[PDB]
């Protein structure tokens, strides 16, 4: 696990053989990570939309471990002010909002 | 409630005598709402920081009802692509991330 929100909900993740930190972000539809080199196929995706769009590489069905939970989901790779775990992967880990 | 994240976590809020909808956003530090007229004192605040800054009006200790929970917290008022409930108010309602 239960994570309170007095601080930013940053967790440890393992992706592409690396250890990283990322923010559990219920306001984000998608997961965006920078400085990861993933193997296998990708296609460009345009995201954002305020001020222009940002182009990232979309990798599908990426194995990723989030705070000890080994899951699979789409990961967008490109420059991001902070690494973000979006709803797409929070559903996979069974993460809910509770009050 | 327990809210799953397959869809955007949009909830009903009551603020300044009005009924609105807003996104429960764990990636946002602050709560930003548009098209509300709040009574009492405010001060300008600069937020964002990508491409420039956005100036909003900061109202402190604002009574707000979020999904049935009457709480108090800072509300920033200004144009926002989507009304956002940030961690500052999610802590007030006792909202946690669970998995």
């Amino acid at each position: 696990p239960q994570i309170t929100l007095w601080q930013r909900p940053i967790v440890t993740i393992k992706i592409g053989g690396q250890l990283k930190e990322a923010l559990l972000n219920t306001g984000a539809d998608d997961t965006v990570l920078e400085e990861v080199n993933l193997p296998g196929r990708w296609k460009p995706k345009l995201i954002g939309g305020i001020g222009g769009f940002v182009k990232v590489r979309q990798y599908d069905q990426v194995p990723i471990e989030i705070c000890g939970h080994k899951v699979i989901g789409t990961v967008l790779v490109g420059p991001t002010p902070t690494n973000v775990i979006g709803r797409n992967l929070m559903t996979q880990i069974g993460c809910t909002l509770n009050f | 409630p327990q809210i799953t994240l397959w869809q955007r976590p949009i909830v009903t809020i009551k603020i300044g005598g009005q009924l609105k909808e807003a996104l429960l956003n764990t990636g946002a530090d602050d709560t930003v709402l548009e098209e509300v007229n709040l009574p009492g004192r405010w001060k300008p605040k600069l937020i964002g920081g990508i491409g420039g800054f956005v100036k909003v009006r900061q109202y402190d200790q604002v009574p707000i009802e979020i999904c049935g929970h009457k709480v108090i917290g800072t509300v920033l008022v200004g144009p926002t692509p989507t009304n956002v409930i940030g961690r500052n108010l999610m802590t007030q309602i006792g909202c946690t991330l669970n998995f």
Binding site: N25, D29, G49, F53, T82, V84 | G27, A28, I47, V84
Partner: peptide, 7 residues
Amino acid sequence: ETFYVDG
């Protein structure tokens, strides 16, 4: 740094 996001 409030965040959110789409695309």
